[PDB]
Amino acid sequence: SSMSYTWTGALITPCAAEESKLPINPLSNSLLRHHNMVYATTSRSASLRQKKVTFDRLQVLDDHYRDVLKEMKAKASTVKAKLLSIEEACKLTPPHSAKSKFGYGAKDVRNLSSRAVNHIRSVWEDLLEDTETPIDTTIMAKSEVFCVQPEKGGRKPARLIVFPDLGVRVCEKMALYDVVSTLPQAVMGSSYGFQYSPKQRVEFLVNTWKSKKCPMGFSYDTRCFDSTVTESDIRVEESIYQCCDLAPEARQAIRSLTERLYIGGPLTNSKGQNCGYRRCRASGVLTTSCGNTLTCYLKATAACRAAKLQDCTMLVNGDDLVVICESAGTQEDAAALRAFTEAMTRYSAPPGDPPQPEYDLELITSCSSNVSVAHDASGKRVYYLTRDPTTPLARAAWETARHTPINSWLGNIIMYAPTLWARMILMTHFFSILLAQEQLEKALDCQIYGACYSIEPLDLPQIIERLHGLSAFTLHSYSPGEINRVASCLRKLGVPPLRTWRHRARSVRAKLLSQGGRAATCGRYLFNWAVRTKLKLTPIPAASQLDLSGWFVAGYSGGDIYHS
Ligand SMILES: C=C(C)COc1ccc([C@H]2C3=C(CC(C)(C)CS3(=O)=O)Nc3c(O)cccc3N2C(=O)c2nc(C)oc2C)c(F)c1
Ligand SMILES: [Cl-]
């Protein structure tokens, strides 16, 4: 077999009470009135997810697969990776990262407390000495906020997360942080998605599209990607890692983590009960983003060859895959894509939805997002990435009513700043509240490509200029399709219409402007859309001075990474 999971019967348990309903709160109600449509997942649906992620995997490798692997290993051979010190590794730990079972937590780790450091050291020596004993993991149900989808069904079950102890996570950083931050670009080149800011990603897609004589593209969605990852896949990943120049201890640690953690191991619930056994990818280890990306790139590159797709360019982020190629015609494209899917299926990665050939770039969705067009102040066409705002808006409402450790609304503003909905709704709403509570200068945690950053709202204009360009503050004449998707979403969720948001923004803009300093800059740049008599926007001096060096280098979702 090789089942992805085996289960004992013990339940996946919560470690505290779980909220599932949006509260009825004046602050969140002014953004979204249909509160009954907004829910959070809980452990109560864990068994539904367990059923979905548990299955037998079929895998047959072939010459195309072996050829692509060799090519990838030859590129990995150019990489030299360094060991992180205990200090560097500790400072990469998020302050609210899950505590250890052995008497210390994240703050102790970041503070280099002797008890934390001593344990981290014992854990490391154990990786150097013990090459085989499976390492324990905890399994938990993830709490996440969605809007009800009565067409698709009703409610999504919780996702499951599997992660080792805090001490092990620190050791993973020491051995592999530099590998996972450098190796994927060296191997995959321009295909590695996490190297691109938002404006660079949209440029890559558009330039790629325009580079073909007659372009065709598709996204490919693998069903339960993490559970399709076999022990063989994980050993192949390691074989690529082992091509880097490594310190001896790093090389041994990688070999031991592979065997003891990454290929599988025991699952324990929050009550300490043996829950089952994993033989697939764990969502909460440092190598999940990097390994999923390599794995998906290897399988898809090899499947493109089998399918005989012509002049393919791929963009890969973890399990998210988009391919743009030269059309051979309607029927031959449909056939070629069916061959592609069969080859992926043999490699263990069958599709959820069958892929569909697309002949318009705007109709491809990758990393939740699609290309759209607007115009800048001078009328020039500007391309940007957008997405359906339903989930962002639901989450923003939840985050307004409940203090959460990570603010998705802030990540959405940063990453979707040129969109009609991020500008008119998210910026207006959150700047209104922060202004009212006098908290514009207080730093808030968000995630960018899975890593956690602490950001001041007042630094948004500079950050946005860097990620999107100055046109982010001047876009208008959005496409009718985009406008209509947003407006219909607002009606669905009971969010006031865009006309109301314009009225609210004029008032926030005025108050920001009144305060001078960085608030005035926010007023001037973030809300220029809200006035007829517009201000001429020049480049922001602080923008060129920003250190964004580590922002768009690699993906770290599930990897417990905090960047200062
Ligand atoms: C630049 C663009 C505009 C388009 O491309 C993007 C856009 C966003 C991300 C980040 C992010 C998100 C939420 C944000 C914005 C709120 C924060 S984010 O930047 O981390 N979502 C998504 C998705 O919705 C879908 C895929 C991946 C991620 N992302 C992850 O990293 C990630 N990986 C896993 C396993 O789960 C998650 C959530 C990305 F990687 C690429
Ligand atoms: Cl092989």
From Swiss-Prot:
PTM annotation, UniProt: The N-terminus is phosphorylated by host PRK2/PKN2.
Cofactor binding summary note: Binds 2 magnesium ion that constitute a dinuclear catalytic metal center.
Compartments where found: Host cytoplasm; Host endoplasmic reticulum membrane
Binding site for Mg(2+) 2: 221, 319-320
List of residues that carry Phosphoserine: 30, 43
Domain RdRp catalytic: 215-333
Reaction equation(s) it catalyzes: RNA(n) + a ribonucleoside 5'-triphosphate = RNA(n+1) + diphosphate
Regulation: Activity is up-regulated by PRK2/PKN2-mediated phosphorylation.
Membrane topology type: Single-pass type IV membrane protein
Effect of residue 406 to V: In strain: Isolate pCV-J4L2S
Cofactor names: Mg(2+)
Record text on subunit structure and interactions: Homooligomer. Interacts with non-structural protein 5A. Interacts with host VAPB. Interacts with host PRK2/PKN2. Interacts with host HNRNPA1 and SEPT6; these interactions facilitate viral replication. Part of the replication complex composed of NS2, NS3, NS4A, NS4B, NS5A and the RNA-directed RNA polymerase.
Reported function: RNA-dependent RNA polymerase that performs primer-template recognition and RNA synthesis during viral replication. Initiates RNA transcription/replication at a flavin adenine dinucleotide (FAD), resulting in a 5'- FAD cap on viral RNAs. In this way, recognition of viral 5' RNA by host pattern recognition receptors can be bypassed, thereby evading activation of antiviral pathways.
Annotated protein name in UniProt: RNA-directed RNA polymerase
Full-protein positions shown: 2420 to 2982 of 3010
